[PDB]
Amino acid sequence: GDDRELAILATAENLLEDRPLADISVDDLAKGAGISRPTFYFYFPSKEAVLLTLLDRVVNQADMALQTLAENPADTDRENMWRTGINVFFETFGSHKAVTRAGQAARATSVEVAELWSTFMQKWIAYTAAVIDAERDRGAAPRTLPAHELATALNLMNERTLFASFAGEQPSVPEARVLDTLVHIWVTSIYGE
């Protein structure tokens, strides 16, 4: 039953690694999942709903990993704290590059995908800002920019930079360098001046 749903999702993630969603048909998803096309439409109204489901799984995986980190701080310096947090997104989305790239593109076309991404970005930015505010309250970071505006720009940088690296866009930071690059910019802008 729901097994067939997971088969549809797995087939979609596999096919997205080699072609965009526009080049994938409902019949391709049904055929790969071992079901008929009418049976597919029982589980999903469209191939776009399949992508939205895949993206929802990935963003919730990242959100849950960040929540785990937040509840069990690693005893390290400040640079390591930020690196471990940025790494949650590097590893989670980097493990699902086809879904990430496809979900990014679908933001222009799908209001559901745009709303899903916006909801989680607001959550992650609020958490970033709250940690920056905590660092300021304890005297470790200077009161420079409004924390929420700083957090917004830094999170948007990570979105654009990580996704460019994963897609091998030109220009991009090589994926083997992108964590160090982002961590440097976060740490200097949060603690600097």
> Distance (Å, rounded) from C-alpha 101 to C-alpha 22?
13
Instruction: Identify residue 126 by its one-letter amino acid code.
Output: A
By CB under 6 A, is residue 159 in contact with ligand Q2N? yes
Q: Show contacts with ligand Q2N in window 113-132 (CB under 6 A).
A: 121, 124, 127-128, 131
Q: Does 179 bind ligand Q2N (CB under 6 A)?
A: no
Q: Which is nearer to a copy of itself, 50 or 178 (CB)?
A: 178
Q: CB under 6 A: which stretch of 26-34, 46-54, 136-144, 154-162 binds ligand Q2N?
A: 154-162
Contacted entry of a copy of itself, ligand Q2N, none for residue 65, CB cut-off 5 to 8 Å set by kind: none
Contact in structure between 16 and 99 (CB atoms under 8 Å): yes
User: Would you give the DSSP letter of residue 107?
Assistant: T
Answer yes or no whether residue 162 interacts with ligand Q2N by CB under 6 A: yes
Nearer to a copy of itself, 33 or 52 (CB): 52
Q: Which residues contact 151 (CB under 8 A, 6 or more apart)?
A: 125, 126, 128, 129, 132
**DSSP three-state, residue 20:** coil
CA distances from 95 to 12, 39, 152 (A): 15, 29, 24
Question: Minimum CB separation from ligand Q2N for residue 149, in Å?
Answer: 15
Q: Which residues bind a copy of itself (CB under 8 A)?
A: 105, 108, 118, 121-122, 125, 144-146, 149-150, 152-157, 159-161, 164, 169-174, 177-178, 180-182, 184-185, 187-189, 192-193
- The distance of closest approach from Cβ of residue 186 to a copy of itself in the complex, given in angstroms and rounded to an integer, is 9
Cis peptide before 45 (omega within 30 of 0): no
Q: 40 CB contacts (<8 Å, ≥6 apart)?
A: 8, 26, 29, 30, 33
When the beta carbons of 29 and 131 are compared against ligand Q2N, the nearer one is 131
173/162 Cα distance (integer angstroms): 8
**Interface with ligand Q2N (CB under 6 A):** 81-82, 85-86, 89, 93, 121, 124, 127-128, 131, 155, 158-159, 162-163
